[PDB]
């Protein structure tokens with residue numbers, strides 16, 4: 001899109017990208033398509049967290065355990081698919097979803113703490129209430145799994161995205177795709193290897209001893225980690241590469257994430273290239289006109 | 292909202308809905324929020340199927356079996372996340388994702404059959420190529436599972452959404468949520484029933500003999516059916532109730548699904564009430580003056 005004046009501003013900047021590899025251009029294109037939403041979500045989560053802390057809500061609302069008040073996981077369950085009612089509740093405009101009069105009288109005055117918040121702040125806070133418990137739980141489980149993986153020495157033979165003495169965690173995740181129950185049974189010593197020969201089988205078999213005595217919850221977290229960490233590590237590495245290119249080449253001078261300046265925001269670019277990442281890459285190579 | 296002239300047109304029509312239950316109003320609200328997209332998707336899929344059939348593509352492309360050409364399932368895998376490229380290929384603008392030069396020369400002239408299609412028709416055709424194999428496979432598995440359920444007599448004690456001699460399929464689906472592996476093990480006779488008292492357990496235990504002789508694939512289809520059919524039947528029942536209300540009360544005289552007439556399209560209404568279904572229900576019962 002755009003007219004000739006804007007075209008002439010951006011066209012020279014494509015020279016900054018000469019000599020980038022196809023992998024770097026893919027990483028950069030991914031970053032352009034996805035960073036504005038990630039930045040906006042982080043900014044709103046930070047606003048919500050600051051309100052939640054400042055108003056004292058955590059005194060009675062822990063993420064995944066009940067105290068004087070219900071956990072945020074339980075609140076999220078009560079308002080599943082009903083975020084607009086959660087916002088109305090926080091404004092004092094809807095009754096409690098359940099409970100009796102004693103609990104109602106505990107929570108009712110605390111709604112005073114939210115008077116004078118803007119609609120955008122209430123929206124961010126409602127988003128946070130609906131989502132933070134699952135995010136906290138997933139981080140707790142991943143930390144448990146990472147600690148087991150390190151303490152038992154699995155990484156010596158299992159890197160995230162490269163083969164060594166053993167297969168990469170990416171290859172393991174491929175072998176167990178949609179078969180997490182079988183991965184847990186394998187880690188318990190209850191199923192044979194998915195493939196390979198006897199030599200590889202003999203290397204890995206004694207290492208299963210390192211997992212005896214783990215609880216079912218620990219094995220579940222470890223299995224989740226094995227299935228998911230390679231892609232998470234690869235995405236982080238690619239985003240770091242892209243961010244470094246974006247900074248080094250000066251693109252941020254005209255492209256903020258969610259505000260227009262000399263150039264369009266990255267959110268507006270992402271909308272222009274929605275479902276057309278192949279075209280974004282070709283544009284970055286100087287091979288396609290402005291949208 | 293809308294103004295005085297428009298509000299005066301619609302306001303009397305809410306009298307049509309006096310006498311509806313809360314459940315009927317919920318079904319009607321769901322229908323208003325979802326029917327325009329459902330109808331649009333059905334129209335697009337019908338257009339794509341007609342093109343695929345009339346241009347002869349099926350002669351070499353079966354849904355889930357290779358013949359002269361790759362199966363639609365294989366094409367869908369190759370173009371996963373690359374729909375824009377699929378459309379460009381169908382337009383004659385991109386070479387083949389692989390294969391030898393001989394197979395490339397077989398397919399290349401067939402693209403002239405797509406000359407004259409609109410961008411919208413090509414998008415519908417690409418959608419169809421990406422989705423139809425999975426859709427056909429799911430329908431085949433559900434038909435197999437329904438036939439087993441009916442021929443083995445399970446419905447004598449298991450209705451979809453009401454308890455009889457045995458629990459409803461909705462209650463079974465709740466008990467096995469996220470535990471389909473355990474449901475398959477149970478159907479095989481390998482896990483003694485969780486616990487409804489020894490009397491209830493002894494009613495169901497002999498019926499597991501009905502399933503001896505099923506393949507693993509048939510048991511998986513049956514387990515899928517048990518987990519999903521109650522919600523599917525409930526949604527169909529609610530949609531049928533809502534469609535009948537919408538037709539009998541005359542709402543379609545002014546509300547078409549995807550085009551504006553005297554009143555806004557159902558697509559516009561759905562966008563206005565996105566995430567605000569509770570406000571839509573209150574509007575329909577006349578308990579909430581109009582925007």
Ligand code: HEC
Pocket residue numbers: 001002003006007008009010013014016017032246249250251252253254255262263264269272283289290291
């Ligand atoms: C100010 C001097 C800019 C710098 C530095 C960079 N860009 Fe830019 N960009 C700028 C303008 C004024 C526009 C709009 C141009 C138009 O003709 O409308 C753009 C546009 C883009 C786009 C979108 C292209 C499209 O087809 O819509 C992209 C993907 C883009 N710019 C990327 C980009 C990168 C990676 C940069 C650093 C190498 C960069 N821009 C620098 C202004 C400026």
Ligand code: HEC
Pocket residue numbers: 052055056057058059060061068069070075078089095096097098099100103104105106107110111113114129
């Ligand atoms: C202890 C003194 C509390 C503090 C401080 C806050 N809340 Fe609370 N909350 C508390 C109780 C005992 C309950 C249950 C109330 C009931 O009637 O059952 C709640 C409930 C909530 C809910 C759920 C509302 C629903 O309809 O289910 C929410 C969304 C909620 N509380 C939010 C909230 C916020 C944002 C707070 C800081 C301003 C806060 N609470 C403080 C107890 C206590």
Ligand code: HEC
Pocket residue numbers: 152153154155156157158165166167172175186192193194195196197200201202203204207208210211226
């Ligand atoms: C090198 C001495 C290893 C260490 C330390 C660990 N593993 Fe391993 N692993 C290794 C090999 C050579 C193989 C291939 C085995 C084969 O027979 O082909 C594996 C395989 C796995 C798998 C895949 C199992 C499958 O069925 O495909 C998993 C899930 C696995 N290994 C996990 C794992 C864990 C959790 C470890 C720390 C306790 C661990 N491995 C250590 C080599 C080595």
Ligand code: HEC
Pocket residue numbers: 343346347348349350351352359360361366369380386387388389390391394395396397398401402404405420
């Ligand atoms: C047999 C005479 C064919 C008919 C009729 C159609 N197609 Fe085909 N198709 C055929 C072959 C042998 C191949 C593989 C070619 C190769 O180079 O490997 C294909 C491939 C496709 C693809 C995949 C393209 C890709 O880049 O992977 C698509 C999307 C496709 N064919 C679509 C298609 C349509 C829409 C047809 C009717 C107009 C059609 N094909 C007819 C063989 C034959």
Ligand code: HEC
Pocket residue numbers: 440443444445446447448449456457458463466477484485486487488491492493494495498499501502517
């Ligand atoms: C009446 C004579 C029944 C027929 C015919 C079938 N089932 Fe049944 N089923 C029945 C009862 C009374 C119960 C509850 C038993 C209890 O211990 O509480 C059940 C239970 C099931 C379940 C749930 C298993 C669980 O662990 O919760 C399933 C999945 C089930 N039944 C499936 C099923 C199928 C597939 C049948 C046809 C082969 C079938 N049942 C027949 C009573 C009766």
Ligand code: HEC
Pocket residue numbers: 292293294297298300301304305307308323537540541542543544545546553554555560563574581582
């Ligand atoms: C023509 C005489 C109509 C008939 C019959 C029905 N509706 Fe209607 N509707 C009509 C107009 C002109 C408008 C716009 C009103 C405005 O203020 O701009 C509407 C609006 C609606 C809406 C949206 C309300 C909102 O707040 O946006 C809904 C949900 C709606 N109408 C539903 C509806 C139903 C269920 C009807 C049959 C009982 C029905 N309408 C009849 C015009 C006409």
